[PDB]
Ligand binder design. Structure first.
Ligand SMILES: *[B]([O])([O])[C]([C]C1=[C]C(C([O])=O)=[C][C]=[C]1)[N]C(=O)[C]([N])C1=[C][C]=[C][C]=[C]1
Ligand SMILES: [Ca+2]
Length: 263
């Protein structure tokens, strides 16, 4: 496997569109390497981690409980809701909704959680308020996956997302319990098998969240490291090609193989 930045540029060569990449040291926050760090990419389902950050912040502020059961109708269901579609009678707790949104990419679960915080506008305010003046959520699922227009809506940058993820996971913004719950959900991710996880050696820790959108869009955010503990943050986004799902998966896995090999 080639050097990581070479592999990233190669992925872009093969896919077309743009590929963005950043690797951060978790302990220090220092940027180790990057490519297109400050360019915008659609967040796609990766936003669901930030959403649950906002939910946990409200729990920490005594405004929400993870045990609170939410009921909803079949009319609330949108595409890609593999968990929520199974609980129309019994409903789901806020904590269960976050697990579904993060670990299964459940869209209705995300929408229901957005409602609890006051919508995409309030998620953006939450981000602005913790120091992220770049990332913006403008739409609900499943419209936010349009990857254009309109036009910088529903976007982040690799460095914005990486910095914000780091603050959520290790900063004093959330309580220790809440930081732990957020990473626990990400560690339990069920649908990112073919991505960074495919290149992960035995004994390593990974907590991640993937996403997919229109116009060749794919992405992953991760905290990972050897010896069962995370030590670096990795964010990879891609958009603006006609690449099939399999090919986009392959390039991300190959970037992963590279950054592990050249750790
Ligand atoms: B999303 O990325 O905001 C959402 C759900 C989804 C997540 C993942 C993943 O890897 O986490 C993947 C596939 C879908 N995306 C969509 O709702 C989008 N319309 C979509 C749905 C199916 C396949 C591609 C895109
Ligand atoms: Ca290029």
């Amino acid at each position: 496997h080639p050097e990581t930045l070479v592999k990233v540029k190669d992925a872009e060569d093969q896919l077309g569109g743009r590929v963005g990449y950043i690797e951060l040291d978790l302990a220090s926050g220092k940027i180790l390497e990057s490519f297109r760090p400050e360019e915008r990419f659609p967040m796609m389902s990766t936003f669901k981690v930030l959403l649950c950050g906002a939910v946990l912040s409200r729990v920490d502020a005594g405004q929400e409980q993870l045990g609170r059961r939410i009921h909803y109708s079949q009319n609330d269901l949108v595409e890609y809701s593999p968990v929520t579609e199974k609980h129309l009678t019994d409903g789901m707790t806020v904590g269960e909704l976050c697990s579904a949104a993060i670990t299964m990419s459940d869209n209705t679960a995300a929408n229901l959680l957005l409602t609890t915080i006051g919508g995409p506008k309030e998620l953006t305010a939450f981000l602005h308020n913790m120091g992220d003046h770049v990332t913006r959520l403008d739409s609900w699922e499943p419209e936010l996956n349009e990857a254009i227009p309109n036009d910088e809506r529903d976007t982040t940058t690799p460095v914005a997302m990486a910095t914000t993820l780091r603050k959520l996971l290790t900063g004093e913004l959330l309580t220790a319990a809440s930081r732990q719950q957020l990473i626990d959900w990400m560690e339990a991710d069920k649908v990112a098998g073919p991505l960074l996880r495919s290149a992960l050696p035995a004994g390593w820790f990974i907590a991640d969240k993937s996403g997919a959108g229109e116009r060749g869009s794919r992405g992953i955010i991760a905290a990972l490291g050897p010896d069962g503990k995370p030590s670096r943050i990795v964010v990879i986004y891609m958009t603006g090609s006609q690449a099939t799902m399999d090919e986009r998966n392959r390039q991300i896995a190959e970037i992963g193989a590279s950054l592990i090999k050249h750790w």
